[PDB]
Design an enzyme around this catalytic site. Structure first.
Site, PDB file in Angstrom:
ATOM      1  N   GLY A  23       0.795  -1.213   0.000  1.00 14.96           N
ATOM      2  CA  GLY A  23       0.000   0.000   0.000  1.00 14.96           C
ATOM      3  C   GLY A  23       0.829   1.266   0.000  1.00 14.96           C
ATOM      4  O   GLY A  23       0.344   2.333   0.391  1.00 14.96           O
ATOM      5  N   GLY A  27       7.275   1.529   0.203  1.00 15.47           N
ATOM      6  CA  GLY A  27       7.987   2.176  -0.877  1.00 15.47           C
ATOM      7  C   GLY A  27       7.682   1.494  -2.197  1.00 15.47           C
ATOM      8  O   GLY A  27       6.622   0.871  -2.379  1.00 15.47           O
ATOM      9  N   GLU A  28       8.612   1.616  -3.128  1.00 13.41           N
ATOM     10  CA  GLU A  28       8.400   1.146  -4.503  1.00 13.41           C
ATOM     11  C   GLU A  28       8.786  -0.340  -4.635  1.00 13.41           C
ATOM     12  O   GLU A  28       9.769  -0.664  -5.295  1.00 13.41           O
ATOM     13  CB  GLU A  28       9.247   1.980  -5.462  1.00 13.41           C
ATOM     14  CG  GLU A  28       8.765   3.439  -5.617  1.00 13.41           C
ATOM     15  CD  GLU A  28       7.330   3.512  -6.118  1.00 13.41           C
ATOM     16  OE1 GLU A  28       7.035   2.985  -7.221  1.00 13.41           O
ATOM     17  OE2 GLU A  28       6.497   4.096  -5.406  1.00 13.41           O
ATOM     18  N   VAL A  29       8.021  -1.222  -3.995  1.00 12.07           N
ATOM     19  CA  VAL A  29       8.254  -2.655  -4.128  1.00 12.07           C
ATOM     20  C   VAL A  29       7.045  -3.338  -4.722  1.00 12.07           C
ATOM     21  O   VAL A  29       5.929  -3.204  -4.223  1.00 12.07           O
ATOM     22  CB  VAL A  29       8.577  -3.340  -2.773  1.00 12.07           C
ATOM     23  CG1 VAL A  29       9.830  -2.723  -2.172  1.00 12.07           C
ATOM     24  CG2 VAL A  29       7.416  -3.167  -1.812  1.00 12.07           C
ATOM     25  N   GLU A  89      13.298 -13.274  -3.903  1.00  8.21           N
ATOM     26  CA  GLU A  89      12.150 -14.165  -3.880  1.00  8.21           C
ATOM     27  C   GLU A  89      11.031 -13.623  -2.972  1.00  8.21           C
ATOM     28  O   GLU A  89      11.285 -13.044  -1.907  1.00  8.21           O
ATOM     29  CB  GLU A  89      12.566 -15.599  -3.427  1.00  8.21           C
ATOM     30  CG  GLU A  89      11.374 -16.580  -3.426  1.00  8.21           C
ATOM     31  CD  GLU A  89      11.738 -18.037  -3.073  1.00  8.21           C
ATOM     32  OE1 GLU A  89      10.883 -18.917  -3.315  1.00  8.21           O
ATOM     33  OE2 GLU A  89      12.855 -18.302  -2.560  1.00  8.21           O
ATOM     34  N   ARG A 140       8.186  -5.040  11.601  1.00  9.87           N
ATOM     35  CA  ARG A 140       7.778  -4.499  10.308  1.00  9.87           C
ATOM     36  C   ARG A 140       8.858  -4.727   9.221  1.00  9.87           C
ATOM     37  O   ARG A 140       8.537  -4.652   8.047  1.00  9.87           O
ATOM     38  CB  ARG A 140       7.456  -2.975  10.421  1.00  9.87           C
ATOM     39  CG  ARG A 140       8.712  -2.125  10.720  1.00  9.87           C
ATOM     40  CD  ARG A 140       8.438  -0.617  10.982  1.00  9.87           C
ATOM     41  NE  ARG A 140       9.644   0.004  11.528  1.00  9.87           N
ATOM     42  CZ  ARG A 140       9.895   0.168  12.822  1.00  9.87           C
ATOM     43  NH1 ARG A 140       9.016  -0.214  13.771  1.00  9.87           N
ATOM     44  NH2 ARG A 140      11.069   0.667  13.173  1.00  9.87           N
ATOM     45  N   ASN A 141      10.112  -5.011   9.598  1.00 12.77           N
ATOM     46  CA  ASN A 141      11.203  -5.281   8.641  1.00 12.77           C
ATOM     47  C   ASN A 141      11.606  -6.775   8.553  1.00 12.77           C
ATOM     48  O   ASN A 141      12.687  -7.128   8.042  1.00 12.77           O
ATOM     49  CB  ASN A 141      12.453  -4.494   9.024  1.00 12.77           C
ATOM     50  CG  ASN A 141      12.466  -3.097   8.435  1.00 12.77           C
ATOM     51  OD1 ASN A 141      11.961  -2.870   7.322  1.00 12.77           O
ATOM     52  ND2 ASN A 141      13.023  -2.152   9.180  1.00 12.77           N
TER      53      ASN A 141
HETATM   54  C1  LIG Z   1      12.283  -6.415  -3.243  1.00 17.60           C
HETATM   55  C2  LIG Z   1      13.191  -6.253  -2.018  1.00 17.60           C
HETATM   56  C3  LIG Z   1      14.455  -5.630  -2.163  1.00 17.60           C
HETATM   57  C4  LIG Z   1      15.320  -5.461  -1.027  1.00 17.60           C
HETATM   58  C5  LIG Z   1      14.899  -5.934   0.281  1.00 17.60           C
HETATM   59  C6  LIG Z   1      15.729  -5.801   1.530  1.00 17.60           C
HETATM   60  O1  LIG Z   1      15.359  -6.388   2.578  1.00 17.60           O
HETATM   61  N1  LIG Z   1      16.866  -5.054   1.452  1.00 17.60           N
HETATM   62  C7  LIG Z   1      17.941  -5.049   2.408  1.00 17.60           C
HETATM   63  C8  LIG Z   1      18.925  -4.028   2.317  1.00 17.60           C
HETATM   64  C9  LIG Z   1      20.013  -3.976   3.251  1.00 17.60           C
HETATM   65  C10 LIG Z   1      20.135  -4.964   4.304  1.00 17.60           C
HETATM   66  C11 LIG Z   1      21.332  -4.846   5.283  1.00 17.60           C
HETATM   67  N2  LIG Z   1      21.675  -3.498   5.628  1.00 17.60           N
HETATM   68  C12 LIG Z   1      20.594  -2.715   6.307  1.00 17.60           C
HETATM   69  C13 LIG Z   1      21.022  -1.220   6.429  1.00 17.60           C
HETATM   70  N3  LIG Z   1      22.345  -1.072   7.127  1.00 17.60           N
HETATM   71  C14 LIG Z   1      22.720   0.373   7.288  1.00 17.60           C
HETATM   72  C15 LIG Z   1      23.781   0.551   7.685  1.00 17.60           C
HETATM   73  O2  LIG Z   1      23.843   0.375   9.226  1.00 17.60           O
HETATM   74  C16 LIG Z   1      23.405  -1.918   6.466  1.00 17.60           C
HETATM   75  C17 LIG Z   1      22.957  -3.403   6.377  1.00 17.60           C
HETATM   76  C18 LIG Z   1      19.146  -6.007   4.410  1.00 17.60           C
HETATM   77  C19 LIG Z   1      19.209  -7.086   5.508  1.00 17.60           C
HETATM   78  F1  LIG Z   1      18.947  -6.528   6.679  1.00 17.60           F
HETATM   79  F2  LIG Z   1      18.333  -8.054   5.356  1.00 17.60           F
HETATM   80  F3  LIG Z   1      20.412  -7.651   5.517  1.00 17.60           F
HETATM   81  C20 LIG Z   1      18.063  -6.037   3.467  1.00 17.60           C
HETATM   82  C21 LIG Z   1      13.623  -6.564   0.400  1.00 17.60           C
HETATM   83  C22 LIG Z   1      12.790  -6.726  -0.716  1.00 17.60           C
HETATM   84  C23 LIG Z   1      11.533  -7.375  -0.504  1.00 17.60           C
HETATM   85  C24 LIG Z   1      10.532  -7.981  -0.344  1.00 17.60           C
HETATM   86  C25 LIG Z   1       9.402  -8.752  -0.196  1.00 17.60           C
HETATM   87  C26 LIG Z   1       9.409 -10.104  -0.121  1.00 17.60           C
HETATM   88  N4  LIG Z   1       8.133 -10.581  -0.061  1.00 17.60           N
HETATM   89  C27 LIG Z   1       7.342  -9.511   0.065  1.00 17.60           C
HETATM   90  C28 LIG Z   1       5.919  -9.436   0.307  1.00 17.60           C
HETATM   91  N5  LIG Z   1       5.376 -10.370   0.569  1.00 17.60           N
HETATM   92  O3  LIG Z   1       5.259  -8.238   0.186  1.00 17.60           O
HETATM   93  N6  LIG Z   1       8.122  -8.294  -0.113  1.00 17.60           N
HETATM   94  C29 LIG Z   1       7.765  -6.972   0.076  1.00 17.60           C
END
Ligand SMILES: Cc1ccc(C(=O)Nc2ccc(CN3CCN(CCO)CC3)c(C(F)(F)F)c2)cc1C#Cc1cnc(C(N)=O)n1C
Length: 284
Positions: A23, A27-29, A89, A140-141
């Site tokens: 919703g 963001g843009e996912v 995935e 939520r994450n």
């Molecule tokens: C398309 C997509 C793209 C990217 C990501 C994503 O999680 N990106 C991500 C980016 C960085 C990091 C690690 N850093 C965090 C910041 N940090 C800042 C620096 O401190 C650095 C370390 C991690 C982590 F935490 F998992 F490792 C994940 C999730 C989705 C999704 C999805 C999905 C799956 N099913 C559904 C559904 N059903 O609706 N959806 C929505």
């Protein structure tokens, strides 16, 4: 095999793009399908259009380094030309907060709540081992798939979620109730501030997704913690889990356990709980 080859780059037209997920709050996912492999995916896009580009490329760079069963796993990107894509995935049941809030509690029992805590602490031990800092760990994450699989994710929500989850603080947007004292006051983040957030995430799990610090103004949270006020043990939360919870919320970050310690403790508790569960179900 050829000059311009990049093992992570995919062809945008391999993916059918469908509806936006969440919703707009995420963001843009978009939901998508990687046609060749009959795989439903989720796709984050920037979509052209100047200005957010650096953080998108940074996210992709980070995800190329992360491979663990309880963390999201990059399948591919498109970052040669806009629109940019980051592809993983699809996880069947969406984010853990809404999952807890809508679940069948006969299905999602105490043993399942421990399984989910255990999986999250496994992902965090991996990040700690790799010296990464999550910086916004919260239900939520997290994402839920089949058989109560949980994967830690991050959707960069501070800019995207509406309401009071995130509020203005030090010029940015902070989820005040998940944020360690040193992070609120001195803007210091580390794996120990993630540990503090994990404690709050445990409280979310224990209450099936209640909002933290119920009925307390965000503006009084820091002053209360400074007096050593902490959230009380939720009904039904086992004492050993509440104790770990309290260790995560030690004022001094160096006094908090490591995720290696936390994960060991959960694996033990889960294995204990799993036995007691197979026994009680094995009546009938
Ligand atoms: C398309 C997509 C793209 C990217 C990501 C994503 O999680 N990106 C991500 C980016 C960085 C990091 C690690 N850093 C965090 C910041 N940090 C800042 C620096 O401190 C650095 C370390 C991690 C982590 F935490 F998992 F490792 C994940 C999730 C989705 C999704 C999805 C999905 C799956 N099913 C559904 C559904 N059903 O609706 N959806 C929505």
């Amino acid at each position: 095999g050829s000059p311009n080859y990049d093992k992570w780059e995919m062809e945008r037209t391999d993916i059918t793009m469908k509806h936006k997920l969440g919703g707009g709050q995420y963001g843009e996912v978009y939901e998508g399908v990687w046609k060749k492999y009959s795989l439903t995916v989720a796709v984050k896009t920037l979509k052209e259009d100047t200005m957010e580009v650096e953080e998108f490329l940074k996210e992709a760079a980070v995800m190329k380094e992360i491979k663990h069963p309880n963390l999201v796993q990059l399948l591919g990107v498109c970052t040669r030309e806009p629109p940019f894509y980051i592809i993983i995935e699809f996880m069947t049941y969406g984010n853990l907060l809404d999952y807890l809030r809508e679940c069948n509690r006969q299905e999602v029992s105490a043993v399942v709540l421990l399984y989910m805590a255990t999986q999250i602490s496994s992902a965090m031990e991996y990040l700690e081992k790799k010296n990464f800092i999550h910086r916004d760990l919260a239900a939520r994450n997290c994402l839920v798939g089949e058989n109560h699989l949980v994967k830690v994710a991050d959707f960069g929500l501070s800019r995207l979620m509406t309401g009071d989850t995130y509020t203005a603080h030090a010029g940015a947007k902070f989820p005040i109730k998940w944020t360690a004292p040193e992070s609120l006051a001195y803007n210091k983040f580390s794996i120990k501030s993630d540990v503090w957030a994990f404690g709050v995430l445990l409280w979310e799990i224990a209450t099936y997704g209640m909002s933290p610090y119920p009925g307390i103004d965000l503006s009084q949270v820091y002053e209360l913690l400074e007096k050593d006020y902490r959230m009380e043990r939720p009904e039904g939360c086992p004492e050993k889990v509440y104790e770990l919870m309290r260790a995560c919320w030690q004022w001094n970050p160096s006094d908090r356990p490591s995720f290696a310690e936390i994960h060991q403790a959960f694996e033990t508790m889960f294995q204990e709980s799993s036995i007691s569960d197979e026994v009680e179900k094995e009546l009938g």
